[PDB]
């Protein structure tokens, strides 16, 4: 039982291209653990007029 929240003002347009791919990434090194995603939902909406 515990919850964490974080948020930073990130101006996405100047770091990422108009078109982008999204997804998950996980790694291991000298030490390790198993990472698994049990579910995934995503919704993006973008207006098209200045």
């Amino acid at each position: 039982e515990t919850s964490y929240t974080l948020n930073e003002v990130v101006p996405l347009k100047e770091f990422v291209p108009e078109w982008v791919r999204i997804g998950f990434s996980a790694t291991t090194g000298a030490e390790f653990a198993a990472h698994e995603v049990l579910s995934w939902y995503f919704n993006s909406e973008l207006s098209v007029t200045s």
């Binding site: 039982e1 974080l6 930073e8 999204i22 998950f24 996980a26 653990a33 579910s39």
Partner: protein, 181 residues
Amino acid sequence: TETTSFSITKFGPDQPNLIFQGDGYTTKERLTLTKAVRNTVGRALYSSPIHIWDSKTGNVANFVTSFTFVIDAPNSYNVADGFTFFIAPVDTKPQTGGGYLGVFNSKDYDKTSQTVAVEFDTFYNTAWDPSNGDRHIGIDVNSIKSINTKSWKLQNGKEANVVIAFNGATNVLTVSLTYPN
């Protein structure tokens, strides 16, 4: 209004929505990025590209992603390295593994990286992680050093629900992890 959505609640051997990179595979009905093995990198990407912003208007998208994840470590003391949700260019390939979470190649600001990522880092890397040495949720952008972090108590084997949202207007990324029970 350009839009893109999908919900997945049962990954399968043949689960075509995704793109598997590295040692990523879909087993036990769950998206398996890595297992309890050394030096591996497992990434999975949504097949369809998404329009995050537009040039001839300057409009930026508004989005939300919700996912449940599980980091199961054999030993709760020695855990590594981290999970990560990322936004990268359309042709992303796995980058440096290990402490670099597979999405970055260095600590310096690599303008051409074009990758922003909300990381859940379970291993202290003295070279660039917060001095306190705590596991943490961090927001990276063009480098493995987070521009901001929040200490987090990994619950070995328990599933945390994460909710990340982005407001195109105010441009504030929001990340919330919650361990039910």
